Design an enzyme around this catalytic site. Structure first.
Site, PDB file in Angstrom:
ATOM      1  N   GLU A 191      26.631  65.095  31.364  1.00  0.00           N
ATOM      2  CA  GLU A 191      26.398  66.265  30.523  1.00  0.00           C
ATOM      3  C   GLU A 191      26.621  66.010  29.034  1.00  0.00           C
ATOM      4  O   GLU A 191      26.022  66.675  28.192  1.00  0.00           O
ATOM      5  CB  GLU A 191      27.279  67.432  30.980  1.00  0.00           C
TER       6      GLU A 191
HETATM    7 CA   LIG Z   1      31.290  64.932  33.122  1.00  0.00          CA
END
Ligand SMILES: [Ca+2]
Ligand SMILES: CC(=O)N[C@@H]1[C@@H](O)[C@H](O)[C@@H](CO)O[C@H]1O
Ligand SMILES: [Mg+2]
Length: 374
Positions: free
Chosen positions: A175
């Site tokens: 992410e």
């Molecule tokens: Ca992560």
């Protein structure tokens, strides 16, 4: 027993000492000069570990999940997958490489042995009931999923890797470099990509997620940018999610609905609280009236650093982990944060990392696996 490592002592190559109640073999003839702190856990150029003198995919009900370094770093070089200790239930290979655009590749660190041997090591670990999954993240953890073409490259290339090596599935630890923010195309495309990939692989497909808590529980308090940005990804893949183990480190404390103030970083309460939010569900600071629907306890674990070298903040003792586990599973030994009901099927614990734990003398894996094991 092996003699304890001690400063002022002259060691020869092959000498075996005890440190943190584990063994290390000397790589270099040397003296551990006083005040130098060349201890085995801190000195991989001097010491190597070892020596002596639903329905989801089936895996360990109470699992210890750890990351295996497909690289060298201050923990030391990579080591053969065959040598990963029996205390680990899920071995997460870190990492795959972004290759663009949408393309993913994997290349084995030669210190782990040949690709053929690595593939045999995977089978041997699976034969013992372990899962071996490929993680998306790390230095080349910036995935682009902005159009259908990149989605297809993602799906096809990962399918090739999984089928070639025999990985059980994938872990999403991507992410921070992949621009996962509220409203970004990657949010929808990632869910679609994983679904398409699993369709090609079949119902044995293992899927885990390791997002940092601002991307998940942060949504309770703020929804925008990275905050809460992972929630529709979880929601879209909830039927396929084997386990989510949020990283409760490097991001300070956590605001939950279970206390008037934030839960302190490194506390059992934060681990229990973060896990409760994922299981019970919680309102999202949407601006609308949005809510995150809770997951099954068997889909939830908590992620912690294995030791002081594993992160910048959020360190926990083995005792703290044990307290959070028994609190979640049996409602006993809880702090100021208590589950509404017991979760006997709570999945367990994730750590960064297998390598740091090994370097430090299995000081995390040994007691934590024992706790999981009742
Ligand atoms: Ca992560
Ligand atoms: C009493 C005994 O056997 N102790 C050994 C110890 O010497 C060795 O360093 C360690 C690592 O395998 O395994 C233990 O079982
Ligand atoms: Mg640190």
């Amino acid at each position: 027993a092996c003699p304890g490592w001690a400063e002022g002592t002259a060691y020869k190559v092959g000498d075996v000492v005890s440190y943190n109640n584990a063994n290390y073999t000397a790589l270099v003839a040397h003296t551990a000069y006083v005040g130098a702190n060349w201890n085995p856990a801190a000195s991989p150029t001097l010491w190597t570990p070892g020596g002596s003198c639903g329905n989801t995919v089936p895996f360990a009900k109470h699992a210890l999940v750890g990351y295996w370094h497909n690289f060298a770093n201050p923990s030391g070089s990579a080591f053969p997958l065959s040598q990963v200790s029996a205390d680990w239930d899920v071995i997460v290979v870190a990492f795959a490489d972004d290759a663009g655009n949408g393309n993913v590749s994997f290349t084995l660190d030669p210190a782990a042995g040949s690709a053929a041997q690595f593939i045999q090591d995977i089978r041997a670990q699976q034969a013992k009931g372990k899962k071996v999954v490929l993680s998306l993240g790390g230095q080349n953890g910036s995935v682009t999923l902005n159009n259908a073409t990149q989605v297809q490259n993602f799906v096809n290339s990962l399918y090739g890797i999984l089928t070639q090596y025999g990985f059980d599935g994938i872990d999403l630890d991507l992410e921070s470099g992949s621009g996962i923010v509220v409203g970004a195309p990657v949010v929808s495309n990632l869910v679609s990509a994983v679904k398409q990939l699993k369709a090609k692989i079949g119902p044995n497909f293992y899927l885990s997620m390791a997002p940092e808590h601002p991307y998940v529980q942060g949504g309770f308090v703020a929804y925008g940018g990275n905050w809460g940005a992972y929630l529709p990804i979880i929601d879209g893949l909830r039927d396929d999610l084997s386990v989510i183990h949020v990283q409760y480190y490097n991001n300070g404390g956590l605001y939950t609905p279970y206390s008037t103030g934030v839960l302190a970083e490194g506390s059992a309460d934060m681990l229990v609280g973060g896990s409760k939010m994922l299981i019970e569900g919680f309102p999202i600071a949407n601006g609308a009236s949005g809510s995150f629907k809770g997951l099954r306890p068997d889909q939830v674990a908590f992620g912690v650093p294995s030791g002081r070298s594993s992160a910048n903040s959020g360190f926990v003792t083995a005792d703290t982990v044990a307290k959070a586990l028994t609190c979640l599973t049996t409602l006993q030994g809880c702090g100021s944060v208590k589950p509404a009901q017991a979760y006997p099927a709570f999945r367990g614990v994730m750590t960064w990392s297998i390598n740091w734990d090994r370097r430090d003398g299995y000081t995390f894996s040994r007691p934590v696996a024992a706790s999981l094991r009742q």
